[PDB]
Design an enzyme around this catalytic site. Structure first.
Site, short mmCIF file in Angstrom:
data_model
loop_
_atom_site.label_atom_id
_atom_site.label_comp_id
_atom_site.label_asym_id
_atom_site.label_seq_id
_atom_site.Cartn_x
_atom_site.Cartn_y
_atom_site.Cartn_z
N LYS A 165 12.76 -2.20 0.62
CA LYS A 165 11.36 -1.84 0.67
C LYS A 165 11.31 -0.35 0.72
O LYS A 165 11.92 0.27 1.58
CB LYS A 165 10.66 -2.50 1.86
CG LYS A 165 9.21 -2.11 1.94
CD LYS A 165 8.44 -2.85 3.02
CE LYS A 165 6.98 -2.50 2.89
NZ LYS A 165 6.12 -3.14 3.90
N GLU A 180 0.60 -13.14 3.92
CA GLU A 180 1.20 -12.15 2.99
C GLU A 180 2.48 -11.55 3.58
O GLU A 180 3.32 -11.04 2.83
CB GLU A 180 0.20 -11.02 2.66
CG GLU A 180 -1.03 -11.46 1.89
CD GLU A 180 -2.35 -11.54 2.72
OE1 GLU A 180 -3.29 -10.75 2.38
OE2 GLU A 180 -2.46 -12.42 3.66
N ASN A 181 2.60 -11.62 4.91
CA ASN A 181 3.72 -11.04 5.71
C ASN A 181 4.65 -12.10 6.18
O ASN A 181 5.50 -11.84 7.02
CB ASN A 181 3.17 -10.36 6.99
CG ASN A 181 2.46 -9.07 6.70
OD1 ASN A 181 2.71 -8.42 5.67
ND2 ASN A 181 1.54 -8.68 7.60
N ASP A 202 6.64 -9.12 8.89
CA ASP A 202 5.78 -8.17 9.64
C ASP A 202 6.57 -7.62 10.77
O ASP A 202 7.01 -8.39 11.60
CB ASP A 202 4.66 -9.04 10.20
CG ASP A 202 3.57 -8.27 10.86
OD1 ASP A 202 3.48 -7.03 10.68
OD2 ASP A 202 2.76 -8.96 11.51
N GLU A 220 16.94 -8.55 4.57
CA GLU A 220 17.16 -9.89 4.12
C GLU A 220 16.24 -10.22 2.94
O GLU A 220 15.03 -9.96 2.97
CB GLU A 220 16.89 -10.86 5.29
CG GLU A 220 17.01 -12.35 4.96
CD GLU A 220 16.79 -13.26 6.18
OE1 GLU A 220 16.41 -12.75 7.27
OE2 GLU A 220 17.03 -14.50 6.08
N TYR A 221 16.81 -10.86 1.93
CA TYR A 221 16.02 -11.34 0.81
C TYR A 221 15.60 -12.78 1.10
O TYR A 221 16.41 -13.59 1.60
CB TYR A 221 16.85 -11.19 -0.45
CG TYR A 221 16.42 -12.00 -1.67
CD1 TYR A 221 15.16 -11.86 -2.22
CD2 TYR A 221 17.29 -12.88 -2.25
CE1 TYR A 221 14.80 -12.59 -3.33
CE2 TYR A 221 16.94 -13.62 -3.34
CZ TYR A 221 15.70 -13.48 -3.90
OH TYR A 221 15.43 -14.21 -5.05
N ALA A 222 14.32 -13.08 0.89
CA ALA A 222 13.75 -14.42 1.07
C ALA A 222 13.41 -14.94 -0.30
O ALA A 222 12.41 -14.52 -0.89
CB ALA A 222 12.49 -14.36 1.92
N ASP A 282 -0.84 -8.33 12.96
CA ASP A 282 -1.61 -8.72 11.77
C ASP A 282 -0.73 -9.72 10.98
O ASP A 282 -0.39 -9.49 9.82
CB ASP A 282 -1.92 -7.44 10.96
CG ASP A 282 -2.95 -7.66 9.85
OD1 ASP A 282 -3.93 -8.41 10.05
OD2 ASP A 282 -2.78 -7.03 8.78
N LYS A 299 0.83 -1.21 0.00
CA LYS A 299 0.00 0.00 0.00
C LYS A 299 0.86 1.27 0.00
O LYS A 299 0.55 2.23 -0.68
CB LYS A 299 -0.96 0.00 1.20
CG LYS A 299 -1.98 -1.15 1.19
#
Ligand SMILES: COCCOc1ccc2cc1OCC(=O)N(C)CCCNCc1c[nH]c3ncnc(c13)N2
Length: 259
Positions: free
Chosen positions: A39, A137-138, A151, A88-90, A133, A20
């Protein structure tokens, strides 16, 4: 920290996800060749939404969290218009997308995810940190399929958003406690096994009543050990929820989790 970060330190790659407040990008630090996620959040948006200073707090909290199942924040910085989180990249992406591809998870994948979440939350409780939350998605996946919580640790405002993952105490305007995270495990355990979260509805206000009442059912294929765990976690009264050790020691978790 050890370094001053600027955008020119990084080669940006493809978008990993769109949120968002902005997007997450693949990136590479130019000198070290270290791959990561960046991000990028727009200040104007954060301001207008009234979350600008909340983010700051959560970043500070996050910067002190080191655990294999918690996504690492390496640093952050800004320019006139944007905030940048260096993460960190996942590489295996979100649990959300894995859940869409599979529709639902078998008991061993679920039990192992729950174990990994519970370890990360237990490390966070030892620091007095909580979450709000936590949702597929997190939650992210590392190179060997290991769960990573993306998150950030939660920090409150002064004393419309989706209700699916919130416990009765948050929504009834009541006092809250680490036990919120126990509720989150329950919701996630259910969603991993069933394919949807347990208090879903076409309306927010209906979802509100379902949560307040703890009104939900299990499909016939959900087994008794799983029904046992989920039902103990989704207790209306925070004090009746088990401790994290009891989740990790629960027979259904220990029968199905990868050790
Ligand atoms: C305030 O900010 C708190 C940090 O929140 C996040 C950190 C890292 C994230 C996602 C985060 O929030 C959710 C979000 O913004 N989405 C757009 C959901 C998409 C998930 N990304 C996909 C993704 C794939 N490989 C990744 N490696 C690292 N980070 C990633 C991703 N994304």
């Amino acid at each position: 920290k050890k370094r001053q970060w600027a955008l020119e330190d990084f080669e940006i790659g493809r978008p990993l996800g769109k949120g968002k407040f902005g997007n997450v990008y693949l990136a590479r630090e130019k000198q070290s060749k270290f791959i990561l996620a960046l991000k990028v959040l727009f200040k104007a948006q954060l301001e207008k939404a009234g979350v600008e200073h909340q983010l700051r707090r959560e970043v500070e909290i996050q910067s002190h969290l080191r655990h294999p199942n918690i996504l690492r924040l390496y640093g952050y910085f800004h320019d006139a218009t944007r905030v940048y989180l260096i993460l960190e990249y996942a590489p295996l992406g979100t649990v959300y997308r894995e859940l869409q591809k599979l529709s639902k998870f078998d008991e061993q994948r679920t039990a192992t995810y729950i174990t990994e979440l519970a370890n990360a939350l237990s490390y966070c409780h030892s620091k007095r940190v909580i979450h709000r939350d936590i949702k597929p998605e997190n939650l992210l996946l590392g190179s060997a399929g290991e769960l990573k919580i993306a998150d950030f640790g939660w920090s409150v405002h002064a004393p419309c958003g989706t209700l699916d993952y919130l416990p009765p105490e948050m929504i009834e305007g009541r006092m809250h406690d680490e036990k919120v995270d126990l509720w989150s495990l329950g919701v996630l355990c259910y969603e991993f096994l069933v394919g949807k979260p347990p208090f879903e509805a076409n309306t927010y206000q209906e979802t509100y009543k379902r949560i307040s009442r703890v009104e939900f059912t299990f499909p016939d294929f959900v087994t008794e050990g799983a029904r046992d765990l989920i039902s103990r976690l989704l207790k209306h009264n925070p004090s009746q929820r088990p401790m994290l050790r009891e989740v990790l020691e629960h027979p259904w978790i220990t029968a199905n989790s990868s050790k």
